[PDB]
Symmetry: C3
Subunit: 345 residues, 3 copies
């Protein structure tokens, strides 16, 4: 009885995002997405540590789904018989039935079709939540992603002016809990079930061993740095399904930030660092003003540098010496300098 146009969306792997319109004059549609659960061993750091992961569509995070206010979202969730455990899905964007989790529990070899109406604008987490202690374990094993519900008029600045991005990236941050042996080395396991009891012990102490973007330390550095150009307005969606984060663009700012992630609320302007509460997604716009490398981090710098949570942007364009310049390059401290007379000596 729901008589609306259907449109199939093909998702893509983060940090990229499937094609979509920002503002639209299309009416509501049934937007059709498919997510396939994949349990698999994955590499999670630069020394090659492996991890028994559980994923939607084979990536951590799961892919970003993008729809508009008033759309209906029809998700086919597939759990292939190569998997070992039951899984489900819960959308923070949806209303009722534990976000859908109470309607989507599937054993290996099954699939299920859920439809939810996109009544709330913003970016939101989705994640597996099979029940009881399985809920944190499936989420911290990788089973989480995000959905963005745009207003039909696109974003605005909360003061009646339109905002448009030239580029969008989805940064999913994952806290991981990898057991260590007596000597302090990370342990390997042959299946998720085998990893569980030792992993739950690490989870109970609430301190991750790794905090990574796009599934692995170094995932978005080197060859896979994020590209941009001076002058582009870039939207950075950040999610964390289980633990707080404090995003910061080193060398930049958040020009417009919805740190609680919901477009019915005006964004804050000109932030240095913002805050993603565990269990949520947020979003920040920035217009690049300078070329060069930028690091995007969580600004617990121990997590950023030592546990895996740094991404890079490589920005092409012309340097602006008015905004910043090296007035004098490193040189020897002048013989005639008198720093021994300073107040703090």
């Amino acid at each position: 009885d729901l008589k609306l146009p259907r449109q199939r969306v093909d998702l893509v792997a983060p940090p990229f995002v499937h094609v979509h319109e920002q503002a639209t004059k299309q009416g509501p549609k049934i937007m059709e997405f498919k997510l396939v659960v994949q349990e698999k061993k994955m590499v999670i750091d630069e020394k090659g540590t492996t991890f028994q992961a559980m994923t939607f569509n084979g990536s951590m995070p799961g892919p970003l789904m993008v729809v508009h206010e008033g759309d209906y979202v029809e998700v086919t969730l597939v759990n292939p018989a190569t998997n070992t455990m039951p899984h489900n899905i819960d959308f923070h964007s949806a209303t009722g039935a534990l976000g859908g989790g109470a309607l989507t529990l599937i054993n290996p070899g099954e699939q299920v079709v859920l439809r939810w109406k996109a009544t709330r604008t913003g970016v939101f987490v989705y994640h597996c939540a099979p029940g009881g202690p399985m809920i944190p374990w499936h989420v911290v094993s990788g089973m989480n992603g995000a959905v963005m519900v745009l207003p039909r008029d696109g974003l605005n600045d909360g003061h009646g002016h339109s905002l448009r991005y030239d580029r969008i990236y989805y940064i999913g941050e994952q806290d991981l809990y990898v057991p260590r042996d007596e000597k302090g080395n990370f342990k390997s396991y042959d299946s998720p079930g085998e990893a569980y009891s030792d992993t739950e012990e690490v989870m109970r102490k609430l301190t991750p061993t790794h905090v990574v973007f796009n599934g692995k330390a170094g995932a978005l550095t080197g060859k896979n740095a994020l590209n941009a150009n001076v002058g582009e307005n870039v939207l950075i969606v950040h999610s964390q399904a289980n633990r707080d984060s404090r995003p910061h663009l080193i060398g930049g700012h958040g020009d417009y930030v919805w740190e609680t992630g919901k477009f019915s609320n005006a964004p804050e302007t000109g932030l240095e660092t913002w805050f993603i509460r565990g269990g949520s997604a947020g979003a920040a716009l920035y217009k690049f003003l300078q070329p060069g490398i930028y690091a995007y981090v969580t600004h617990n710098l121990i997590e950023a540098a030592n546990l895996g949570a740094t991404a890079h942007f490589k920005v092409e364009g012309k340097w602006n010496d008015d905004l910043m310049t090296q007035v004098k390059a490193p040189a020897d401290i002048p013989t005639g300098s008198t720093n021994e007379n300073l107040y703090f000596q």
Copy 2:
């Protein structure tokens, strides 16, 4: 010389709240409350672990006090001689004398009467704070609650429209620090003083062993689930006197949320997850749109599922298939399906 009507309020045990008016045309009154300190052993999880607690009025959290802007609040704090330690009270809603703590220190066998004017609207923490290392120890042993100071016109949406709740609940979240023996089992003690040195060692590592609502894992699940009905606007006051929390209603949203908890500031709309800074109370309104079970959690899901921090709502009414529906129930993956051709394989 303060010549105002006096009115005695009888408090009730959380998560319920004493009767009160939201909007009022009554002028300022002296609102009279009594809190009695009770030290006692309490059960704090589903395996029966006991804990040497310290409470106001025998509950964790202490009861919610509700007054209106401009009222004076006259609290009699009683420390019976069955107790072993000095106690006091500090109201974050009050001005001066460390929130009252500097005027309320009482030994066992004593009582004291403090009056403070309710000049600041919002929900606020109160807690014991005897001095030095006793302050965290008394708070994490259970000695904290909240007070709500409503505007005399009731709540509003920050854009000139009145908000009214049909139902109010007070969720106090408590981080607990229970010592373990060599084998990892929780230790029992015969008095608070006996528990102190081992408890302080756990406190120093900043990682709770339990994170509970209404004093115990499972307190607000099963028979003691919170009731509501489709269509009701429910106010959920959440406090945490010592540690951050990130509340989330699974299956719902925060329609209007004052996460810093102060009604002079407009609420944010349509949140998935909000943030209670340690040392504060916040409040969220939600109008239920779907029947069924909802879980209310802190969205560190390890804390929610494994350390005790889940409550349930049981909501009666009719399901709305427009907002969400199971289009196809779990079924075998069709023989003819082609999932091996997906981008991520």
Copy 3:
């Protein structure tokens, strides 16, 4: 080619702040500051524990720099040859080159001159960031401070009214990671390089051993309590370069708080406790209404009382019995009292 008046600013040690104008009709200037790196052993708690610190200008935090929107800030960073490591500086207030870090790396015996334009208003962190795992280590060793960029019209309340402070203090909060030996005692080292490997092990577990204001437990208590007077509007700038904090003035409120620290956004009013995200600075105004001692804490009370994070204000003036009064001093519980009949017994 930048033809503007130059003005040299002499910095002072926190928590005080160099002299400056709040509102100004002066046009943009080049504001000249000098920071000298000093590595040195410092005492960090009341039992005399020492720490191999690294500082700007010999203090933790580094000094507060205050400029106005549109100024250019020309910083000479000096690394004397008595130091052992390379250092640099990154300003969250600046645009480009990792906030300046990519233009300021200096070996011992060198200095460098960076100029950045103050295009963003607010309070912001600055810190050393030499590269890779050196970044967290230099920051948690003390190499961080803050800069305030005021609007040229001074502060306002976001609703078109001017705000002016009578007094400003800069509270820098530092999380420290001090190794312990087998017996649990803090270890001492003869140099930063010698401390590094054991310190990095403590850093990886993300739990500080000390959380201090102005560099040491007790720094701003006793003789060095902060002064104020009833009626004064006091601005309290709080920074944390690496870890979240939740500031609270015990006995007071935040009348106007910019917890994300950026003056383009209206402040929130009447807060009990606010939140400084790690990697940021925030600011709160309060007009003192009562004399006496106030404690300013992070409201994880374990950190405040047991790990060093308490400051005091000593406020002179006349008590206001209307706002708060002790109606009856501690007395014996009346023989005739009937507390055994209360609901919770």
